[PDB]
Amino acid sequence: INYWLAHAKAGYIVHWTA
Protein backbone atom coordinates (compact mmCIF):
# COMPACT_ATOMS: atom_id res chain seq x y z
CA ILE A 1 0.00 0.00 0.00
CA ASN A 2 0.97 3.64 -0.32
CA TYR A 3 1.48 4.00 -4.05
CA TRP A 4 2.41 7.66 -4.22
CA LEU A 5 5.13 7.91 -6.84
CA ALA A 6 3.90 11.48 -7.17
CA HIS A 7 5.98 12.58 -10.13
CA ALA A 8 4.03 12.71 -13.37
CA LYS A 9 3.21 9.74 -15.56
CA ALA A 10 -0.11 11.44 -16.22
CA GLY A 11 -0.43 13.16 -12.86
CA TYR A 12 0.09 9.77 -11.26
CA ILE A 13 0.31 11.76 -8.04
CA VAL A 14 -2.38 10.57 -5.66
CA HIS A 15 -3.24 10.87 -1.99
CA TRP A 16 -3.85 7.43 -0.54
CA THR A 17 -3.29 6.54 3.10
CA ALA A 18 -2.85 3.42 5.20
Q: Which residues of 1-18 are buried (b: 16+ CB within 10 A; e: fewer)?
A: eeeeeeeeeeeeeeeeee
Asked if 13 contacts 6 with a C-beta cutoff of 8 angstroms, the reply is yes
- The answer for residues whose C-beta is within 8 angstroms of residue 5's C-beta and 6 or more apart is 12, 13
- The answer for residues whose C-beta is within 8 angstroms of residue 6's C-beta and 6 or more apart is 12, 13, 14
User: C-alpha distances in angstroms, 1 versus 5, 13, 14?
Assistant: 12, 14, 12
Say how far apart CA 18 and CA 10 lie, in whole Å: 23
Say how far apart CA 8 and CA 14 lie, in whole Å: 10
Say how far apart CA 11 and CA 16 lie, in whole Å: 14
Say how far apart CA 18 and CA 11 lie, in whole Å: 21
DSSP string, the chain: ------S-TTT-------
